[PDB]
């Protein structure tokens, strides 16, 4: 009887750093996917495995929404089989992703004059990320063979970087808000359904 709370996920006022992306489990409701692509304001709206307009006729055991922020040039790393800083070290998509990727420019919001350095991203890791894996550790990376007995120092680096979001930035580096919707069917009754499933 209560519809899924997508409005409060996109219109939310606060977004997380990409290495600290937030996942919400959506269940037990009817999601009107149309209102997403009816809002033809997104710079990225790409769906894999599922047709966006026929989503309103679909049922799922669970939906998952992953929200974060990246610089626009890195947006293309939000895709299956992609390679780069974000894909390897921040947020990795499986090669069979059945879901949609939505992104829109939020320079007016998340670029504060003099910089908005709150939004971060990971720079190194001992191994590339598995699908849907989040890492927010802050152990000092060891690129050097010698053990990192130092929090900071030669061949021992702090593994996080800050996005210098400023209103005069390049668009490729302007901040963009990103939502990933994944559709999981489990061997249990479906809980999220489209309006047209009638």
């Amino acid at each position, epitope marked *: 009887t209560n519809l899924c*709370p997508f409005g*409060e996920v996109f219109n939310a006022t*606060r977004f997380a750093s990409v290495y600290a992306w*937030n996942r*919400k489990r959506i*269940s037990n409701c009817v999601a009107d996917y149309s209102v997403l692509y009816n809002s033809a304001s997104f710079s990225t709206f790409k769906c894999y495995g599922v047709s966006p307009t026929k989503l309103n006729d679909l049922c799922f055991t669970n939906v998952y929404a992953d929200s974060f922020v990246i610089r626009g040039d890195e947006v293309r790393q939000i895709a299956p089989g992609q390679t780069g800083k974000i894909a390897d070290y921040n947020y990795k998509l499986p090669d069979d992703f059945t879901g949609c990727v939505i992104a829109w420019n939020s320079n007016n919001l998340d670029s504060k004059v003099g910089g908005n350095y709150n939004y971060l991203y990971r720079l190194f890791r001992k191994s590339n990320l598995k699908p*849907f894996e989040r890492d*927010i550790s*802050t152990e000092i990376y060891q690129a050097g063979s010698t053990p990192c007995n130092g929090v900071e120092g030669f061949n021992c680096y702090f593994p996080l970087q800050s996005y210098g979001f400023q209103p005069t930035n390049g668009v490729g580096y302007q901040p963009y808000r990103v939502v990933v919707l994944s559709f999981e069917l489990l061997h249990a009754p479906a809980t999220v359904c489209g309006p047209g499933s009638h």
Partner: antibody
């Protein structure tokens, strides 16, 4: 299913260091992270951090970092948390809890909590 | 940092329906969970993923979350349920924080 057995409620002087233990029973020890939450008397809950038994990754809160050290021991299936540079406002009940989900943080089981009081 | 808003205390006659709210800016974007801390004991999880109950929790417990509020509803409350209730969310937005609420002192005028 699962139990989290804590250590005794040690009680120490200001500026000292207190180390608490938490052993898990029943489940595969390294499958779930272990978090530590403290409670000031008559007040709310403060998240202190967590440690992953699988790899030894330790994550701390902004407030307690630089004083807290969380460690793991898989050969005994036991985690521990160490708090140094105690002040009076550290008088609290410290529980250990099991992180059921890593993406959506929420806690299955809780330790009975150990009472650490910092007075004169 | 961002923080959760809980009422001081809510009191109801036995058998009534107690409702404990949890306030946060677009708190629907994240998953909330509810823990019962009985009087002077270890807390225990009552509600998770905003609706689901652990196997063992009575069905009179029921959660919800939307807009700027998550609500815990206990129908047919008795004197036993009288305890403290804490709503907790994950907020990596604010520098890897496991955020709790201020608690609420449910009281039954037995």
């Amino acid at each position: 299913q699962v139990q989290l057995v804590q250590s005794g409620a040690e009680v120490k002087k200001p500026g000292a260091s207190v180390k608490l233990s938490c052993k898990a029973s029943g489940y595969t020890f390294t499958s779930y992270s272990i978090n530590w939450v403290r409670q000031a008397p008559g007040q709310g809950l403060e998240w202190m951090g967590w440690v992953n038994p699988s790899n030894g990754v330790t994550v701390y809160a902004q407030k307690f970092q630089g004083r807290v050290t969380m460690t793991r021991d898989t050969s005994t299936s036991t985690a521990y948390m160490e708090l140094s540079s105690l002040r009076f406002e550290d008088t609290a009940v410290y529980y250990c809890a099991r992180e059921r989900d890593q993406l959506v943080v929420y806690f299955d089981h809780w330790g009975q909590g150990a009472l650490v009081t910092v007075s004169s | 940092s961002y923080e959760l808003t809980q009422p001081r205390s809510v009191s109801v006659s036995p058998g009534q329906t107690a409702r404990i709210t949890c306030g946060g800016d677009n708190i629907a974007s994240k998953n909330v969970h509810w823990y019962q801390q009985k009087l002077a004991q270890a807390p225990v999880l009552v509600i998770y993923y905003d609706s689901d109950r652990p196997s063992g929790i009575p069905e009179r417990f029921s959660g919800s979350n939307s807009g700027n509020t998550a609500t815990l509803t206990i129908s047919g409350v008795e004197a036993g349920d009288e305890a403290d209730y804490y709503c907790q969310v994950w907020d990596s937005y604010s520098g890897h924080h496991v955020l709790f609420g201020g608690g609420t002192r449910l009281t039954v005028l037995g």
